[PDB]
């Protein structure tokens, strides 16, 4: 049970990290185009 939940937490954190990277990049692109 803990082995399963512990794994889901790792899966969720990795998806988050990639989205956070994508957000930062998109905010940059938006900054330029807006300027």
């Amino acid at each position: 049970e803990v082995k399963q939940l512990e794994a889901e937490v790792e899966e969720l954190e990795s998806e988050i990290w990639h989205l956070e990277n994508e957000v930062a990049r998109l905010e940059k692109e938006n900054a330029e185009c807006e300027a």
Partner: protein, 35 residues
Amino acid sequence: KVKQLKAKVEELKSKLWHLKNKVARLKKKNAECKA
């Protein structure tokens, strides 16, 4: 314990969902800015 992990999973799920909506919002803003 198993309860704490459960709490982290729910917090991560909520954060992930927020990020997906943010990324989708930034993609549309950028597409429109690029007119």
